[PDB]
Amino acid sequence: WAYSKYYTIGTLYVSWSDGDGITGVPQPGVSSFMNVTLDKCTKYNI
Amino acid sequence: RWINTGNCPFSFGKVNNFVKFGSVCFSLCAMPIVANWAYSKYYTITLYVSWSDGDGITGVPQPGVSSFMNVTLDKCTKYNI
């Protein structure tokens, strides 16, 4: 409230293993996307 | 011949020395309690808190609109200004 009071209305707990096979994706059966732009300075996740 | 700070980012008691938080709540960080036999055996018998940093609540050593100024000049003070 008003950056003046805080109330922990609950808690979410996460457990995680390191490794792969789970990744974030910006959107939800084969073949990778590869949107690549040349010449423009570009943030990448290659 | 019979309150360790543990992992908390502050020590109990000392919290009365004008430390500030954004919020804090208590339940029964790890603030273990121990009883000791002649410093020779130790048995725990635990406090927990949650906090958010910031300001709005302050620990004070002793206790509605005004403010005082306990000031002491020309001598080596421990100030908290």
Side-chain angles (χ1 to χ4, degrees), chain B:
Chain B
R1 301 203 288 159
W2 289 103
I3 320 94
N4 182 291
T5 300
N7 77 320
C8 228
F10 43 86
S11 184
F12 197 75
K14 294 296 186 182
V15 288
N16 296 347
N17 300 326
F18 310 110
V19 186
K20 304 193 72 169
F21 313 85
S23 62
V24 59
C25 290
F26 301 77
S27 183
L28 275 60
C29 79
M31 196 83 201
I33 302 94
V34 75
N36 80 89
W37 175 256
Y39 316 102
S40 300
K41 289 94 180 182
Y42 292 84
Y43 309 86
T44 189
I45 64 151
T46 300
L47 182 279
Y48 303 85
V49 293
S50 63
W51 70 100
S52 182
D53 302 325
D55 55 353
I57 187 64
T58 306
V60 307
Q62 67 287 288
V65 189
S66 62
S67 171
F68 76 139
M69 287 184 59
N70 189 356
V71 182
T72 52
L73 300 176
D74 282 304
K75 295 181 59 65
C76 290
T77 70
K78 184 181 180 182
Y79 61 71
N80 197 310
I81 286 155

Side-chain angles (χ1 to χ4, degrees), chain A residues 6-43:
Chain A
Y6 305 143
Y7 298 90
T8 59
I9 65 172
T11 295
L12 166 56
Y13 306 95
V14 176
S15 69
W16 75 107
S17 179
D18 201 0
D20 302 77
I22 296 295
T23 76
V25 291
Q27 295 294 132
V30 292
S31 310
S32 186
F33 39 79
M34 289 198 296
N35 279 11
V36 169
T37 298
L38 315 182
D39 301 311
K40 308 309 300 177
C41 210
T42 296
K43 172 166 177 157

